[PDB]
Write a protein that binds this ligand. Structure first.
Ligand SMILES: Cc1c(S(=O)(=O)N2CCc3[nH]ncc3C2)cc(C(=O)NCc2c(F)ccc3occc23)n1C
Ligand SMILES: Nc1ncnc2c1ncn2[C@@H]1O[C@H](CSCC[C@H](N)C(=O)O)[C@@H](O)[C@H]1O
Ligand SMILES: [Zn+2]
Ligand SMILES: [Zn+2]
Ligand SMILES: [Zn+2]
Length: 422
């Protein structure tokens, strides 16, 4: 269920019931680690540095004075949160490294109470207007001055000796402490992301559809089938090493090849078919010498020369792609996939895969393309079926590239060998 307000609160930075009274006030504003993970799209780092500097993981800094007026500050906060979260989440989770002072400040821009709905839609209310005594979601908050029923978590309560700086810098070299509140907010959210996502994928947690997930995923799998099918025809590899496949599902089930599975974290139910292995170039550059390695979004330090690779570019701006640890990003599409920083040095043994369509299937505005590898294109004019399938494939390839995925292949790959298959 929820985080019982009885639960003790480690005071080195007492219970939650006590703490809420001290702060100046949905059984609890604080939620479990498990619930925070489910609502990762809602995470906003929050820190405070007598005029107060308010800092958020969006890099925004606001100063209020008893700076700027509180009535102006509280409007800017609702606007910023509404803008950041309206397409991501139905809520906000403030991510804290709790020093005491940030919890004190919430009374000035936060209101709590029972769960309520937007005056304009069926969505849960995230904002309140003192001026009109009305409740809004993130989409309908244009006037509004108070954050309504925000959730929060203190990362210190997960058992960290040392300060924020020392623990953040253990796993991340990308966020330097320029002595301001936003930098602490950024570092704190980074640390929480490290603790919750970097170690492994949680297959059991699924995230709602918020954009083009289904089309992106369908297109990626079409391209995966085409490319691995094509490579196996072209170079006739006796064995495929599928590195980072924890479910033991072949993308080409018909393929005449020995299909070997590996993963750092194989699913229990298929572990019998999958070798536990953590691939690093430094520890396996002399291994998997036979056949071809498939790294379908298996984001290792460096790929060996005999690879087929799909990799997501962490720099891509998308509602699916959240800021991550150490130049990486957290790609939330069905599940949450922490991705290491896109680094070109990883692809040094490979080349970019060129576009093509290949079909050995039976034949059935005329198409003139060297990239349509079909029986009919070999003989002058392309058949209506293969011309149609070509256009559907080009659509899928374009969907995959715009979604931020890139394709790499062993340097000796060529479509010449696919022309020979006819
Ligand atoms: C968006 C997505 C990807 S990804 O595009 O490869 N990726 C995102 C980018 C990224 N960054 N760091 C890791 C990843 C993985 C994989 C899956 C998935 O659910 N995979 C289960 C799965 C297997 F694990 C194995 C075979 C299988 O066939 C059919 C499903 C299946 N999803 C929903
Ligand atoms: N260095 C590494 N060596 C082996 N497996 C790794 C790895 N880094 C990540 N993984 C595994 O890579 C997978 C990425 S998600 C699943 C991707 C899979 N190829 C697909 O088509 O869906 C996870 O199962 C993860 O445990
Ligand atoms: Zn609304
Ligand atoms: Zn960081
Ligand atoms: Zn044809």
């Amino acid at each position: 269920t929820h985080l019982s307000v009885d639960t003790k609160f480690k005071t080195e930075g007492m219970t939650y019931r006590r703490l809420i009274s001290m702060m100046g006030f949905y059984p609890n504003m604080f939620i479990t680690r498990e619930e925070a993970i489910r609502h990762v799209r809602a995470w906003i780092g929050f820190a405070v540095a007598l005029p107060l500097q308010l800092g958020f993981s969006t890099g925004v800094n606001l100063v209020a004075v008893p700076g700027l007026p509180w009535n102006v500050v509280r409007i800017k906060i609702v606007q910023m949160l509404s803008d950041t979260l309206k397409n991501l989440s139905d809520r906000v989770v403030f991510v804290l490294w709790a020093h005491g002072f940030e919890l004190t400040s919430m009374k000035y821009f936060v209101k709590i109470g029972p769960e309520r709905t937007c005056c304009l839609c069926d969505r849960r209310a995230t904002c309140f207007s003192t001026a009109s005594d009305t409740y809004a979601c993130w989409h309908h908050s244009i006037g509004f001055d108070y954050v309504y029923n925000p959730f929060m978590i203190d990362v210190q309560q997960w058992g960290f000796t040392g300060n924020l700086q020392s623990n953040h810098d253990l796993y991340c070299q990308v966020h330097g402490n320029a002595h301001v509140a936003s930098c602490d907010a950024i570092m704190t959210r980074c640390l929480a992301v490290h603790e919750c996502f970097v170690k492994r994928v949680d297959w059991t947690i699924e995230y709602p559809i918020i954009g083009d997930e289904l089309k992106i995923n369908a297109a990626c799998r079409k391209v995966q089938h085409m490319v691995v099918k094509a490579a196996l025809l072209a170079d006739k590899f006796p064995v495929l090493h599928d590195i980072g496949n924890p479910k033991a599902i072949k993308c080409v089930p018909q393929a005449d090849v020995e299909w070997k599975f590996y993963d750092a974290q194989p699913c229990s139910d298929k572990a019998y078919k999958i070798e536990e292995l953590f691939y690093s170039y430094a520890t396996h550059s002399d291994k998997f010498t036979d056949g071809v390695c498939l790294f379908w979004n298996c984001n290792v330090d460096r790929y060996p020369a005999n690879s087929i690779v799909c990799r997501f570019d962490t720099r891509v701006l998308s509602n699916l792609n959240l800021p991550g640890c150490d130049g990486g990003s957290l790609y939330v599409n069905k599940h949450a996939f922490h991705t290491p920083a896109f680094d070109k040095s990883a692809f040094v043994n490979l080349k970019q895969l060129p576009f093509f369509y290949y079909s050995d299937s039976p034949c059935e505005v005329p198409l003139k393309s060297a990239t349509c590898i079909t029986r009919c294109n070999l003989g002058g004019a392309v058949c209506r079926h293969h011309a149609n399938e070509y256009r559907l494939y080009l659509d899928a390839y374009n969907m995959m590239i715009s979604a931020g995925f890139s394709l790499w292949v062993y340097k000796q790959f060529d479509t010449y060998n696919l022309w020979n298959t006819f």
